[model samples]
Target: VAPLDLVQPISDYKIYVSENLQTLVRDTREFTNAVKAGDVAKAKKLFASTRMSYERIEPIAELFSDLDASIDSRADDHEKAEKDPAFFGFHRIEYGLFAQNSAKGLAPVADKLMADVLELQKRIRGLTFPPEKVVGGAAVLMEEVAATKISGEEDRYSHTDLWDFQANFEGAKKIVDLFRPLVVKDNRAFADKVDANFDTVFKTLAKYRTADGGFELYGKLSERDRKVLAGRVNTLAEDLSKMRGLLGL
Candidate 1:
């Protein structure tokens, strides 16, 4: 197999990533403002939606491992679980806003989130996107979603798991779209198969959308619903896993 020169493709991807980082930073400020203002209602409404911007660029976000943990870590990732002083990020703010039913004492957490994201933006500007890791991001995003979000553990406090699921799906899809030309040039049949698989997954996910554009709470999903979603996600993950070899990354 000949090498597929991904220089242009990866440059385009870096632009895409940079734009999403800007969006995330902009949205995070609004979100933090609402939290700092102690506006519980406003913060609750903005919570899941603001996160979509971050999730879209999660692959790039994974590059700065320290900042990623500071921005998105869950209680389970910490030694003391929810009580850990170290457990401060979007999920920590989520705990305060949803579980505690008050935005009280969340200003500091909100401030830390704001600081970490700014740092993320700075780091991303100085770094280059590695093609292999960018390709791998698609698989890992879906893989993580299938394993965690399907269990309804990702957004347990807010039940916003569906939002995260959709964001991860879109992020993976973005990667495929960026590299579609290369994949098709290499093997049209596999490209079409991947497209069909993505369509199937998208249709399955659409079944869970609510009337308002937001999703039904993760708790609303029956066990059967979860099984179907998980199956679709796993299939997509398997298909996306071939992208690296397909692109000679």
Candidate 2:
């Protein structure tokens, strides 16, 4: 059926979330299988790449905050640090593979990660996508990178923050693009400015890309390099925050 109103963008976004969730499930399965086999090299190699799809769906996946934490929260999110029983998921596995340099004890954590993401996939099937949430996601994603990720803390154990950053950027950009027709109809100039901001941020991110289709270690970046990326992200976040108003959401 053809979409008929301003609500059409929300429908489109839900479909996008559904598609990304499929990829998230597939990748998580492979990654966790590697972990369960106690193959540290394979698991570490799969770590950042597997998270790409999850990061892309964060705006929707995070609606189930409990599952979000169970699948992705870092050690700092818990009270007892890495030792916290609550700290188990992607980052938990990340800590084991990247920091401890072994996948020996991560099988259960990997299995739980698989289970939680599968649950997340099922839950999204029943969700009714809110227009405001879809529209506001762009700003939230950008602000997240500007605030937390630019410092290279999101995937600190693996130093794969750029992969996460790029995925978040793509996720936010998808929202803008899905809504762009309406945005252009309302205010062409505003739409163009937002597009420009997206391009600028992407160019900054490109500097860290590696030849093998991954990002360089986050630690390799200089303070000035991080500042430049953060600045671009902040500008994009500012523009994205205006989207809700522009769309009358």
Per-residue alpha-carbon lDDT of model 2 for 22-138, expressed as tens digits?
988998888999899888998898889888888988866547888988988988899998888889899998888999898877888988899998998899898888777766766
lDDT of 2 at 56: 85
RMSD of candidate 1 to true structure, Å: 1.4
What is the lDDT for 232 in model 2? 89
Task: Flag regions of model 2 displaced more than 4 Å.
Answer: 1-4
TM-scores of the candidates are 0.96, 0.96
**Alpha carbon lDDT of residue 192, candidate 2?**
94
Q: How close is candidate 2 to the true structure, as a TM-score?
A: 0.96
Residue pairs of candidate 2 with colliding backbone atoms: none
What stretches of model 1 exceed 4 Å from their correct place? 1-4
Provide the overall lDDT of each model, using Cα atoms, as 2-decimal numbers.
Answer: 0.85, 0.84
